[PDB]
């Protein structure tokens, strides 16, 4: 398992922004601290916050962290271009005999254009592919800004993470972003469930499309 973070957090220069980090009773809620890392583009992660709320030397007091229950949060005041980076929370998980667990990462953007919400097209497996003993669901995501999304697949109502292949976002010719995600199933899986869903999360938008045999 992982810690859930928003794919995109954005604002205007000087704004205060916050990044949530959602865990469970098996990690953040199991007595473990939360730590944060800042990854400037093309660089290695660097320690930003440790022990829920402590700042290393060299990290401005514009950054602050907190932990509450099964969640944690990072706040950035006075947002500027130098803060544009991917931010990862991190804790420890007691399942599977114990492992270090990372958040899914949050891209922080200083808005250079207004936010644009994704459009989603979801295709079911073709009858032709089913005859070839395979099944692929195709989730096409277009026209969003900033360029970071989360794609989640569901079988009926339950999450499915196996057999998922999701692109990093690409920049379309119109300067908004696109992405695609593919779910691989057996034909038996496709036929035996009531439906499958592709859920796309972006800023203040969640769009869920669902297809059925």
């Amino acid at each position: 398992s992982v810690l859930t973070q928003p794919p995109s957090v954005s604002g205007a220069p000087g704004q205060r922004v916050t990044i949530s980090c959602t865990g469970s009773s098996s990690n953040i809620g199991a007595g473990y601290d939360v730590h944060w890392y800042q990854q400037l583009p093309g660089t290695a992660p660097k320690l930003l916050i440790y022990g829920n709320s402590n700042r290393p030397s060299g990290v401005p007091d514009r950054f602050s962290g907190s932990k509450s229950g099964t969640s944690a949060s990072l706040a950035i005041t006075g947002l500027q271009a130098e803060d544009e980076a991917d931010y990862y929370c991190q804790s420890y998980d007691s399942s599977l005999s114990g492992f270090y667990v990372f958040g899914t990462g949050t891209k922080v953007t200083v808005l250079g254009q207004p936010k644009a919400a994704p459009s989603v097209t979801l295709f079911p497996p073709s009858s032709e592919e089913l005859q070839a003993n395979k099944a692929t669901l195709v989730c096409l995501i277009s026209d969003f800004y900033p360029g970071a999304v989360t794609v989640a697949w569901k079988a009926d109502s339950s999450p499915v993470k196996a057999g998922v292949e999701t692109t990093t976002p690409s920049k379309q010719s119109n300067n908004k972003y696109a992405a695609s995600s593919y779910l691989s199933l057996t034909p038996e899986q496709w036929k035996s469930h009531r439906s499958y869903s592709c859920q796309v999360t972006h800023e203040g938008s969640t769009v869920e499309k669902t297809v059925a045999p």
Binding site: V2, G31, Y32, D33, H35, Y37, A44, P45, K46, L47, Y50, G51, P56, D86, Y88, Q90, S91, Y92, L96, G98, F99, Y100, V101, F102, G103, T104, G105, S119, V120, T121, L122, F123, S126, S127, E128, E129, A132, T136, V138, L140, S142, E165, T166, T167, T168, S170, Q172, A178, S180, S181, Y182, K209
Partner: protein
């Protein structure tokens, strides 16, 4: 200052092996636990393995257990990762990371290296399998429908997709391919067309994969 410098990455085929090294300086190496953390292209961070200050305790993520072996040589101030039975899904930048001191609550990674790139890829050419994506009006504007072609499991890049031998260009969006955990590529090409044309106009996607000298023309019919 604390420095961690990784080496040993490279390009290998599935089933191959690599040995990563991390040279530590600027601190007492034998006083700290050390870790490997990796990052697949466009993905987040994933803890790989940890080793205690004097190798007493060693841990692995389930994704690499039994294939990767971590070790250290405190006389040489070096950390190692022996990677056997490599898979395409092991492709990532691999970071050396020091575990910081903490009184409790499980500690943090207080220093990180610059990373070394590991790319696991078969060089064998793979032609695409092409499937029609039958028209659907659910997500399009009024009076139009989206149809497409799925171009599955090819290698290497690139492929070209045209529609009706290049006569249909308006409203075509060919999406960049995904590099799958299998090491093969897949993409989709979708076009929005008038719904009134579906019974009359033929829509054919023309797929060309020059690396394999494979050409596919797939008619996309209403279902």
């Amino acid at each position: 200052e604390v420095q961690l410098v990784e080496s040993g990455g490279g390009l290998v085929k599935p089933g191959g092996s690599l040995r990563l090294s991390c040279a530590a300086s600027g601190f007492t190496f034998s006083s700290y636990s050390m870790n490997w953390v990796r990052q697949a292209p466009g993905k987040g961070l994933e803890w790989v393995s940890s080793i205690s200050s004097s190798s007493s305790y060693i841990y692995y993520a389930d994704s690499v257990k039994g294939r990767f072996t971590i070790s250290r040589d405190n006389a040489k101030n070096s950390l190692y990762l022996q990677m056997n039975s490599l898979r395409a899904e092991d492709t990532a930048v691999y970071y050396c990371a020091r575990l910081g001191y903490c009184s409790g609550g499980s500690c943090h990674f207080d220093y990180w290296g610059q990373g070394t790139l590991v790319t696991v890829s078969s060089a064998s050419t793979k032609g695409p399998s092409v499937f029609p994506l039958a028209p659907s009006s659910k997500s399009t504007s009024g009076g139009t429908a989206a149809l497409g072609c799925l171009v599955k499991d090819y290698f290497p890049e690139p492929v070209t997709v045209s529609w009706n031998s290049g006569a249909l260009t308006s409203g075509v969006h060919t999406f960049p391919a995904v590099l799958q955990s299998s090491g093969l590529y897949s993409l989709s090409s979708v076009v929005t067309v008038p719904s009134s044309s579906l019974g009359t106009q033929t829509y054919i996607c023309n797929v060309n994969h020059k690396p394999s000298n494979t050409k596919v023309d797939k008619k996309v019919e209403p279902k």
